[PDB]
């Protein structure tokens, strides 16, 4: 999954 601050 994407890191907490990604996207």
């Amino acid at each position, epitope marked *: 999954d994407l890191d*907490r*601050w990604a996207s």
Partner: antibody
Amino acid sequence: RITLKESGPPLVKPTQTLTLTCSFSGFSLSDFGVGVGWIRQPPGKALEWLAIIYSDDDKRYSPSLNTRLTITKDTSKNQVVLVMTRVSPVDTATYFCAHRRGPTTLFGVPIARGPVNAMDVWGQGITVTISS
Amino acid sequence: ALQLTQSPSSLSASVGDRITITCRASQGVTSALAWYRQKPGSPPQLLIYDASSLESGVPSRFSGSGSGTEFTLTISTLRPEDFATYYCQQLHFYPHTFGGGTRVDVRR
């Protein structure tokens, strides 16, 4: 000034449970978006990421160790605990906890996420040997 | 999972040299990449965060560039304290992977 320090048993026997504590000062795990993670380093080897926990209490674990790790925080004591079950000899390593910044805010408004991309302050590390 | 490959794994150099270490990711990690220097017996120390930002208190000879799948750390004028092992870390995808490390030692 942020400082972290790891504590726990230096020696542990196979199949046993290992509980490591990270006590820190200079920040609160109630501060916005802050994280505290754990990384280990077997002697002579590379760094290996284990887990991290944020102040809003989201938790994430290494997929390879997921079943044996539990990370938890105690905000009022400024501590983060990592519990590893069923250890075996390959778990002998130096274990480090580390701080991760949350986004910069301006008048309590998140404006920069670049500072979250690193673990910026590390504890000295605690050496753990697993042997019967 | 995501793979982070450092090159070279080992590198020899002398005080005053310019060295550059590179780290390649198997999938794009945007700019979420950090570089660390770890001296024997000590914890890793943050040099560069977010691919290119210089961490506060870190000497200016250290520089980081790149985004996506290819990153580089260059130390422009190697000092004695730089003989050490360097690591890159990706923070875009969980788990937050580390590269294999690159050892920088005294050339002879």
